[PDB]
Amino acid sequence: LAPGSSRVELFKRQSSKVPFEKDGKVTERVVHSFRLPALVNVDGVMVAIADARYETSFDNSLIDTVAKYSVDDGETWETQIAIKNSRASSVSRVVDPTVIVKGNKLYVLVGSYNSSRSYWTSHGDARDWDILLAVGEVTKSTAGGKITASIKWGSPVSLKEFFPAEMEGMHTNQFLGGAGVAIVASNGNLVYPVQVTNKKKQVFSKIFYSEDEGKTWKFGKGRSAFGCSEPVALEWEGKLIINTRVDYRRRLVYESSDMGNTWLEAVGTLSRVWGPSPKSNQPGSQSSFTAVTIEGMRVMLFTHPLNFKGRWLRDRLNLWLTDNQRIYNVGQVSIGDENSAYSSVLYKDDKLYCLHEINSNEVYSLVFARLVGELRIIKSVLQSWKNWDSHLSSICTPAGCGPAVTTVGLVGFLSHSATKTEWEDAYRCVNASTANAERVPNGLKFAGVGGGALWPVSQQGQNQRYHFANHAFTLVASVTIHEVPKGASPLLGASLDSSGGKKLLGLSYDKRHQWQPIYGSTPVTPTGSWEMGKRYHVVLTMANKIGSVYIDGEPLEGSGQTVVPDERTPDISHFYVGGYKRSGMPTDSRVTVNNVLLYNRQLNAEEIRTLFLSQDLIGTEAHM
Template sequence: MYPWLLVGQIERAATGQTKKTLRWEVPALRAGLNPPLENLFQAFSVGGGAGIVTKNGTLVFPVKAVTKEGKEVSLVMYSSDPEENWRLSRGMSAGGCVDPAVVEWGSGRLLMMASCEEGHRSVYESGDMGETWTEALGTLSRVWGNSPERDGSGVQGGFVAATIEERNVMLVTLPAHSTAKTNGQLHLWLTDAAHVVDVGPVSDASKHAAGSALLHTGGKDLISLQELYSVVGDAVGVFDGIYLARLTDMAERVKSVVRAWREADSNLPMACTQPVKSAAGKGDCGVPMPTAGLVGFLSGTVAGGQWKDEYLGVNATVRGVARTASNGLTFNGGGAGAEWPVGRQGQNQRFHFANYNFTLVATVSIDAVPTGGRGIPVMGARLSGEGEGTILLGLSCAADGWEVTFNGVKTMQGVPWRS
């Protein structure tokens, strides 16, 4: 019922040798948790990621337990005096969310990622060492799926916090599948809790990747521990082994992404939401672009029919005739425009937060007032899945002013160009 605490000592290498030995001491901590485990759970099981040491010196381990009602949950145990006293967090994940991993994000704030039976990774945050957990629905929770169809349970993933290029970030390793029949290959992801970038694959493409862990030394070293299986046809074969991979090239790629973020940040002050004319006739920025909570930014980069996200996240697909303009695109003709996918991203949905709340900002210049009785769509959001194609929120330009559509119904027409 109670966990064991094993402490290892790294012994010095013998004279003339470079290899060192790790010697494990006698297991301890068979009892003494506060609160006692038997008060809350019927079992305590394996399935937690690596432990961390917080900025104030607290040792924290993610753990998995089974409640009195038989539900598997994730939580943490922690101690500032590991050999004498341990505490178990009173808060826990929703039932069915297991294989937790934990990082410290900010000062005294914990983020816990767990694989949930509904088919996604839930991310929980706590500012009181796990006494209470809140699902981070507005940022990272439910971004990563466990399978191409986003159903079923997943595996243990790597999850670490780091400071790279003077920016606080998190690194994640999880299997990605291009189709249901392909073997999963580990991918490295980078996020600062707003932007999410798939840095690329980090495991053998001919093997099926399962559990993984990450280590970032604080210097140049980024190391991945990987559980791999052989592949027989379309099926997963036998256990192939545990592999240790030094991700030197990926570490450099991570740095380049962070530098791209910094460049995008520096370019934002030049963007406007409401250009105005100065006395000299030049365009000035009447309202600066809001940046708090900014997730993606489309400007003037286009390639291969894709309008590139300046933060290297999710690109928009260009339709019809378009040409580059200052910090944007010019669309010509009927049906021309761009679509920024949200629910159509497959296994991993980096804009999943839009299912709960989002703000879409666009700077639009209209060359001529439309003629006829039908408005020209300017911007909006459509539903996917059930209710496919229904305009959830839309803004159109008509001859007599703006038209507003909500949930497929025009709610306002002839709204003056300027109020």
């Protein structure tokens, strides 16, 4: 939890009571565990929705949906049961409450089970299952001269009639919300991303939506891959971005422009960025994933545990910030090594909050954290993003002024700022490690075995912000060679392996004053000519499985070669700059590199020309 931030145990395990209703009697009843946080703002009233697991944290046990609500931003709360289970047996339950706010109404979608003791995807049929929608209406008033609120909950309505018996290629079984908070789309639709099972017990994600305030519901025709569960969605630039849990794998993210009729994996942005554990080989989690506007900029906030401990313990809840280009780790919201899986982040009246689980010995509480420090950090990073983008766009490029320098898809920028061991990203997301580097205006001068910079791709580890590069990228730099090498030496490239020996696309230079562009594992043909001490502009582009190399805005002879040989997707280890930064490699690159730009797409010819013409205008030197 950041400096300046603080929390309380709001839903306290084995302590907090809720109004348990049965057979017309209400009794204040202590709850064993609280799970499934959803934290929202309803027209000024903060509402926290959760599971009240009365007897045990076991998933398949007695559970009602609880709400707490506050009119004073969480200083005090009132408590109610929003949705009661069927009371059919000792384990009846309403589950995984998923919330949409529209106007002064909360729409809460829950599964309902009567008597099963088995995990939902293990059920061979829907004998025990229903899917219910309850609506809460929030009214504000002023008793005793003070602002008050109340929430009146409707009786739940089954949406089972809207679940078709078949979906292409399958027979349907059950579906549930993806927990947390869903959305109202820009056309007014209520949109729940849902997790669905078929009779083969496969799980997949769909979009489940309503055009008439929840009276009737439709499924979008498309779907995720099998294995994509518990989805969470937001709307971004006219599209749904649907962010899915995949147990034992990296999270898949999809886009859909047509209310889920067609799903496209978001390979160029967010898909496969977030891993569920260090080695992405453990269970995944529910995630908060929201679009908000902070100081005038639309951005997304994402949470997920790092899960160093493994299995479902899911320690180390982390918060991420992205503009759909750059991806910034705000940091750890939870405290120390506590277990902290499910979460919900709310941005209300320019204050940031998080309701999340803490788990000791499978006894769960929800803490309510005031993310004061995290908001400060987020505002700082966004100011940096805005400022660098403004600055680059403002430059009057050489013909009045030529086309603007493009900042669309500009993810990273290595320029003047460097510490002894790192070359700093101006966008503050991913620094490059360095060795044997000397600071120069807007870059670094390198020498010696082991020398260079490493800008990590898969080497980022669990969370891979530059995964897009496996699909398309542009890497740009200004270079000067200071000594003729003994053989062929590296200058810039994308490496498939950790050494740099196995390249996707690169540029080397040789003892005969020629360039050696490297296209995957294709035999290298030297070409062109360079002069010691002269500065050159280098662009490497990769898209559509094809790699190109440009010097001074022009493609080397024979460029435009296939670099992805066989339909496996690349797994780029890192970009290397100014050497390999590997003492295991015998090369000595004596070179200066300035102003390294990374984009998440293949730039066009105009954009490349503009960068070349503008290369002495773009550095960060005069600003820090």
